[PDB]
Symmetry: D2
Subunit: 123 residues, 4 copies
């Protein structure tokens, strides 16, 4: 459901995710991180399944944030891959990958992996 | 480096990805996979660092593909996170996460992880 | 601390992890999973940092379970990588990789990734 | 397949791993890395499927290395999860997780993920 996803969400670290789910399966919005070499809002773009299953299955989605805005550039990008689970307590459960640009030599230590859970607050 | 991300790339599995990199960090294009519950092209959208470091570092990027098009709906989405390295042989080294929408019961087994390397060859 | 780690632990899915931390950095014990093509106990082996930092840092560790015992064989193995955090509420926070043996053709869909949190019950 | 996992393997980064595979699924040996806060050999322990499927499937395995030896202590541990494929050119394809002990504050950035391919060459 696009409307289900559309809104303001927050995760356990205190980050803000403002997203709009478009009818063609598009996701656009802004991300505000509570951690890292990150200041202010960052543009996010993603995709979700706009025709999910009619049973109790989550809606698959994913989005990317490149950590560069007009104030900072961390030379890194995070992709979140997960599912939206609707109900009274709507959640987005994700696993993420954070890759930093590196020299060829340090490429083996370029990617962090973790997981985030988002709770919806507003539309 | 420079507009070099724009182009048609191919990975080890025969998948093709056509992308346009916008001056300000946007990535847009299509993806056509050769594996999984996939048939035809799919829209892709992502972001990349449009001001990378001057030292010899790669360009951080990432993109998403929801596997639903007019033909098929696999109820899943893959995100690729990596970095582009230009030169005589430009390549995009990535790690990816593929999440399938599941019931809560099967949520523990909802995400696959792998790696793909793309070249313009 | 070996004694801190040694004991009975359980995670959010209802699985049991019985482990002994040896003085040389070794971990041995048994795992009982509440999910998958898994029945009864399985042998686990792992390693942990037996000389961790004197500040509030967790203790790094990891272990493997090959899902084959005398009753079942799932042809798969899981490795858990994480940290032990001591206190009154001792936890082991992990991220895991589950690889299934596959044909070359299906190798791209051989590995699942997830995360588990363990709470200690007994010594 | 068979006792073929036993041996000395090498990965793309120059690391060497010497392993003995026990009849019942145990893996024991040493690892010597060429990258990170590492100096000399480290003990490794793991498990593998000692009764793999007869169809053309790989042998599931995994092992752990805590990065502490008599010389160095990096306060970290890496786990590799993958599968062995025998043949004219045997190889072990793996994905790994490297966790560093951190304060709670930095727990979000405690784990690196990558992939390594080992051959006997
Ligand atoms: N809300 C979250 N913040 C951290 C995790 C995943 S990405 C990350 C922020 C990184 C900030 C910029 C950086 O350090 O590169 N979730
Ligand atoms: N080129 C790639 N194709 C496979 C891997 C990761 S994404 C995947 C295709 C999956 C298609 C949809 C599905 O089976 O659910 N990389
Ligand atoms: N306690 C847990 N059980 C599942 C996760 C990670 S490994 C897994 C069990 C798999 C059981 C055997 C299998 O299906 O291959 N944690
Ligand atoms: N052969 C490999 N070496 C690096 C990757 C994953 S494990 C890593 C070595 C890390 C050494 C310890 C450290 O820096 O903390 N594979």
């Amino acid at each position: 459901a696009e409307a289900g996803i559309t809104g303001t969400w927050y995760n356990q670290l205190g980050s803000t995710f403002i997203v709009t789910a478009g009818a063609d399966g598009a996701l656009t919005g802004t991300y505000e991180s509570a951690v890292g070499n990150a200041e202010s809002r960052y543009v996010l773009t993603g995709r979700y399944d706009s025709a999910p299953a009619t049973d109790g299955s989550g809606t698959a989605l994913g989005w990317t944030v490149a950590w560069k805005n007009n104030y900072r550039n961390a030379h890194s990008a995070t992709t979140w891959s997960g599912q939206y689970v609707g109900g009274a307590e709507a959640r987005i459960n994700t696993q993420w990958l954070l890759t930093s640009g590196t020299t060829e030599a340090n490429a083996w230590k370029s990617t962090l992996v973790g997981h985030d859970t988002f709770t919806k607050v507003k539309p």
